[PDB]
């Protein structure tokens, strides 16, 4: 609504224009900072040309070619100053007008009432502006995205809004339309951030520990992907949501894949509408998508273990980095190494995420060493990503006696790499953020255990219609499994759910045990394995003291790596093997 002085003992630094909802000013003035009124979001900036935008993209009336410079002097007053701009070659026009420092950002007017540039300081003072722009202010316009038997993908991107303006917008619209709305976060921490963004709506958070909750007053349910699925498995009460919204819909975690399959089935039913939010839709394969601010891509050899020299660019870099590693174990290596150098590093994995992410948001740090979990929603105030584009993938060895092993380090998918790189280049920075990476990604992940683990979840979810639910379209071509064969009747089914819910066991594992007719309470299968099935912890053969009072070596019948592939999961499987769980 007009023209403001950028005030910062501390006085006026520059001038900005607020037009059509967006705030415009020179780059040198804010130097990248935020402004206050509450806060003002720095969204866009052409750095070299010297200018920044707040709350969206630039707005223009025309260009030059007879003009006034409404100069807002510091400790002075607005005075309309009219002049003809020079025709200097460089094609940039400019005025011969010298106003004192702090004036930078003043509106230049072609004789109507529409701004055709900004006064740039500074031999002569340019009419600073670029090509036609731009995107759109922090208000959202939507369809038509609520009709039954419809599915929509929003590939949201860190501008205005995102988790900021888009989600509350559709929720406001949904409530206005009396739709029982469900929202799905990948992680508690992302759901928590949803709550602040929604503060003021009837939004109830829903624990996994509760199998269903119902009020019959207009409410909006907020849960983790896995909460949904486990409720779909254990609750008898199909709640008939008509709008389902999935934030970060690219999560290939089986509870996610499952959720997506069920949801897609409700849509085809005619029963639901669905919205899937993600920058990398399942089936997408660009590892270099567009981004809100410029990213410098840098292809360079990166340490996979400790190092002592020739990697100066690492330690020399004067800011916060994100480093994706293929594993907790690899991460210790790198952290251990970084710490030699006197670097504040925070480590993240699935298990530790909920208690260790907030440390990144709330304290002075130098490095994050993260597994791929940070591909789901993770938000960082960092400048550089270091991404060796590697990972471990669980595979069911079909080659004789079945087992799950952590294969790799193998290279990541294009999508996974897009997401890792997608940590960076959200906020305008003085230097373009840096994506430092190594190797090409690989797209064939069809032997990934998660696909069949999903079908295991999926075809054990029962619908009143009697339809077996199935994988979301683009994800169907990832198994040759036939719909329904993993279905498990009787209380083999109930066991299969319990082991997952209370036993904390992976899907595949949970499956093999239930379908053998083993009762949850029974734990002998943890000890009746073949010699080559012996678990080891830090290089010693694991022994555990039973609830009936015996020492036996940890040797399960069916071997699934994910129980023994990081102390925290292994601490757990030990408690299960006891009978504490």
């Amino acid at each position: 609504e007009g023209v403001y002085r950028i005030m910062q003992g501390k006085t006026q630094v520059g001038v900005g224009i607020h037009m059509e909802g967006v705030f415009h000013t020179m780059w040198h003035v804010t130097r990248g900072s935020v402004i206050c009124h509450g806060r003002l979001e720095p969204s866009w900036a052409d750095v070299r040309n010297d200018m920044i935008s707040y709350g969206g993209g630039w707005r223009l009336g025309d260009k030059w070619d007879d003009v006034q410079v409404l100069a807002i002097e510091p400790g002075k007053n607005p005075k309309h100053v009219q002049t003809k701009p020079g025709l200097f070659k460089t094609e940039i026009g400019a005025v011969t007008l010298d106003f004192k420092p702090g004036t930078s950002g003043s509106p230049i007017i072609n004789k109507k009432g529409k701004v055709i540039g900004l006064y740039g300081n500074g031999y002569v003072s340019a009419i600073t502006q670029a090509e036609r722009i731009g995107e759109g202010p922090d208000y959202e316009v939507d369809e038509d995205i609520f009709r039954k038997k419809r599915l929509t993908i929003m590939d949201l991107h860190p501008g205005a809004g995102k988790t900021k303006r888009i989600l509350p917008s559709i929720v406001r619209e949904a409530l206005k339309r009396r739709l029982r709305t469900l929202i799905l976060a990948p992680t508690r921490v992302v759901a928590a951030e949803m709550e602040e963004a929604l503060r003021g709506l009837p939004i109830r958070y829903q624990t996994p520990a509760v199998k269903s909750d119902h009020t019959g007053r207009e409410i909006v349910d907020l849960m983790c992907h896995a909460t949904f699925t486990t409720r779909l498995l254990s609750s008898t009460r199909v709640p008939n949501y008509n709008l389902i919204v999935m934030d970060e819909a690219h999560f290939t975690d089986p509870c996610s894949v499952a959720a997506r399959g069920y949801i897609s089935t409700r849509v085809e039913m005619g029963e639901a509408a669905a919205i899937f939010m993600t920058a990398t839709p399942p089936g997408s394969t660009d590892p270099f998508p567009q981004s809100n601010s410029p990213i410098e891509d840098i292809e360079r050899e990166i340490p996979e273990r400790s190092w002592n020299t020739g990697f100066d660019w690492i330690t020399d870099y004067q800011g916060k980095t994100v480093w994706f590693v293929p594993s907790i174990k690899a991460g210790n290596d790198i952290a251990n190494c970084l710490r030699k150098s006197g670097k504040r590093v925070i480590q993240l994995s699935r298990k530790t995420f909920d208690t260790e992410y907030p440390k990144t948001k709330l304290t002075d740090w130098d490095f994050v060493v993260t597994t791929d979990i940070s591909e789901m929603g993770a938000n960082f105030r960092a400048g550089r990503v270091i991404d060796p584009r590697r990972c471990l993938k669980p595979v069911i060895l079909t080659d004789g006696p079945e087992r799950v092993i952590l294969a790799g380090p193998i290279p990541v998918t294009p999508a996974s790499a897009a997401q890792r790189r997608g940590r960076i280049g959200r906020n305008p920075a003085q230097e373009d953020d840096q994506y430092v990476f190594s190797g090409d990604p690989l797209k064939n992940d069809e032997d990934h255990a998660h696909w069949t683990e999903a079908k295991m979840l999926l075809d054990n979810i029962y619908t009143p219609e009697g339809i077996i639910p199935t994988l979301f379209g683009p994800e169907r071509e990832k198994t040759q499994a036939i719909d329904g064969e993993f279905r498990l009747r009787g209380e083999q089914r109930k066991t299969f759910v319990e082991l997952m819910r209370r036993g904390d066991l992976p899907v595949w594992l949970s499956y093999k045990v239930a379908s053998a007719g083993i009762s949850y309470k029974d734990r002998e299968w943890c000890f009746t394995g073949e010699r080559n099935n012996q678990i080891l912890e830090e290089n010693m053969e694991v022994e555990i003291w039973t609830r009936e009072g015996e020492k036996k070596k940890l040797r399960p019948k069916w071997l699934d790596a994910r129980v023994y592939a990081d102390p925290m999961a292994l601490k757990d499987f030990k408690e299960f093997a006891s009978g504490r769980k």
Partner: peptide, 13 residues
């Protein structure tokens, strides 16, 4: 607080 605003004028002829 680090920087704020103050409405000075409006866009005119």
């Amino acid at each position: 607080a680090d920087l704020s605003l103050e409405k000075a004028a409006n866009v005119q002829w």
